[PDB]
């Protein structure tokens, strides 16, 4: 009948086993060859450990020389959470345009939850090497050690590469800028505002080359959310304890609007919170007539269950163009990268034992 | 094995040998109603069926039940579990049969594409010597520390 050696479902391509070398990932000038890298990672291809570390460290060196608060001019396509959904990241660049001719800004949460986080890091770091002054990456609350060891990035790295590659990602993440000032109008962060941050200068004075502390302004940038009832304030408090996160704070519509007014800003662009449409426009500020807060979320069908759209903000020609997209197929992993023997063997022992017991009564 | 255990096994064998042919066919196993809803029935029969004639004789039935003995060592229990996957009986779990044996157990709880993908990945992360297949050594290295041998004991 069906072969016992040859693969049953031959329409599925067998993933490549060869690990790409330096010569194959970097061209004659040392520029990453992103087409090779994309094609190879789309097939679940892996790199040699030394090449992976080169991408991470060379990207880190570029990030290490950028400011806490980037100055990014328009036009630019702003993007929210990715959470290891590499194949939606492929779709994302289709929707927003190739980075060869498109300025990009990412607000963090590249890893965890999705099971292609290391591919997201490697490809985005390779783009950052190739386009150091037109593709920008900020830190999210997940680009740290506390979360990657609790969720799945650390395990993913140990499964596909090594803890050394993981450690290298952690040192690289410590270099990620925290915020961007976009076209002199928008503060861009992963999470939001801090009680201890009242000026743009307060972000500039921070020391970011560290694990995120458990409290403080750096924590707050990566962790804060708008109030559940943002804009319908019976609450009077500008900042209150964020009981969803267990740390940092909720910030209110008066809090956001005062910050915008003090610092001469149009809106706050952030991410950090899933949205059914991939974005949310919050109540306009009464002095700007413009949404005080914008959440952008770029991980469609989040966790393979939310069934949400994802979106990016293309800001260009004084138009804020929301571009939505749907999820794309992605190869399957068992939860926590479990192999099929570990998965099924307890069921084998169970059912052969059950059969034998029934055979014998 | 133990004498009295042999007497009892001869009686059950006869009860199951519906056409009194001296050998147990697949049909005769499937007559047991419990076995009807068990997806590994055919795999256990094939392992028991060492001479390959498609049925289980008494020698085969005794040798088969003995591997699940309390005195049996881990390597024996795991060697049995290994043969559940090793359809073609060649000592190595190959891609085609790993998929087939898993499809028997999962049924429709996974699509053929998702199962082929996680099967590919296991073949790849586990094949150390690089011959495209999973030996018993490679197999033990993955599942070894799971204490599955403890659940594979029958009182005859």
């Amino acid at each position: 009948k069906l072969s016992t050696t040859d693969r049953v479902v031959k329409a599925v391509p067998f993933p490549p086993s060869h690990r790409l070398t330096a010569k194959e990932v970097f061209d004659n000038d040392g520029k990453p060859r992103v087409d090779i890298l994309k094609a190879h990672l789309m097939k679940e291809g892996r790199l040699e450990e030394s090449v992976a570390l080169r991408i991470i460290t060379e990207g880190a060196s570029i990030l290490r020389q950028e400011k806490n608060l980037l100055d990014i001019d328009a036009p630019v396509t702003v993007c929210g959470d990715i959470h290891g959904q590499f194949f939606d990241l492929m779709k994302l660049f289709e929707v927003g345009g190739s980075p060869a001719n498109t300025r990009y800004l990412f607000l963090g949460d590249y890893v965890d939850r999705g099971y292609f986080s290391i591919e997201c890091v490697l490809y985005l770091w390779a783009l950052k090497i190739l386009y150091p002054k037109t593709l920008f990456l900020l830190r999210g609350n997940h680009e740290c050690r506390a979360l990657t060891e609790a969720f799945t990035f650390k395990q993913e790295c140990k499964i596909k590469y090594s803890e050394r590659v993981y450690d290298a990602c952690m040192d690289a993440f410590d270099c990620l800028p925290l915020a961007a000032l976009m076209n002199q109008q928008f503060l861009c962060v992963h999470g939001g505002l801090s009680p201890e941050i009242n000026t743009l200068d307060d972000i500039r004075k921070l020391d970011r080359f560290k694990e995120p502390p458990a409290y403080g302004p750096m924590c707050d940038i990566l962790w804060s959310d708008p109030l559940e009832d943002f804009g319908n304030e019976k609450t009077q408090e500008h900042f209150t304890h964020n009981t969803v996160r267990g740390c940092s704070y909720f910030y209110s519509y008066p809090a956001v609007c005062e910050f915008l007014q003090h610092n001469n800003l149009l809106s706050i662009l952030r991410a950090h919170e899933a949205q059914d449409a991939g974005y949310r426009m919050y109540r306009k500020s009464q002095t700007t007539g413009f949404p005080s807060l914008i959440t952008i979320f770029s991980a469609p069908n989040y966790l393979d269950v939310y069934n949400n759209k994802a979106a990016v903000l293309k800001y260009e020609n004084n138009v804020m163009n929301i571009r939505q997209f749907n999820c794309s197929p992605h190869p399957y992993w068992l939860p926590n990268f479990m192999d099929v023997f570990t998965w099924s063997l307890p069921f084998v022992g169970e059912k052969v034992t059950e059969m034998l017991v029934n055979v014998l009564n | 094995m133990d004498a009295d255990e042999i007497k009892r096994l001869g009686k059950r064998f006869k009860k199951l040998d519906l056409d009194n042919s001296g050998s147990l066919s697949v049909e005769e196993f499937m007559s047991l109603p419990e076995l009807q809803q068990n997806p590994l029935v055919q795999r256990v029969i094939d392992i028991f069926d060492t001479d390959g004639n498609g049925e289980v004789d008494f020698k085969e039935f005794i040798e088969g039940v003995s591997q699940f003995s309390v005195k049996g060592d881990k390597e024996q229990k795991l060697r049995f579990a290994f043969r559940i996957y090793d359809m073609d009986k060649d000592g190595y779990i190959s891609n085609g049969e790993l998929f087939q044996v898993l499809k028997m157990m999962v049924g429709n709880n996974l699509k053929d594409t998702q199962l082929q993908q996680i099967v590919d990945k296991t073949i790849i992360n586990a094949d150390k010597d690089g011959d495209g297949r999973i030996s018993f050594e490679e197999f033990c290295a993955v599942v070894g520390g799971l204490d599955i041998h403890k659940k594979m004991v029958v009182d005859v």
Partner: peptide, 18 residues
């Protein structure tokens, strides 16, 4: 009976999913 998986002002425009 079967194995289971472990359980001045800018305009704002929209391009819906393709």
């Amino acid at each position: 009976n079967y194995l289971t998986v472990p359980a001045d002002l800018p305009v704002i425009t929209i391009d819906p999913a393709s």
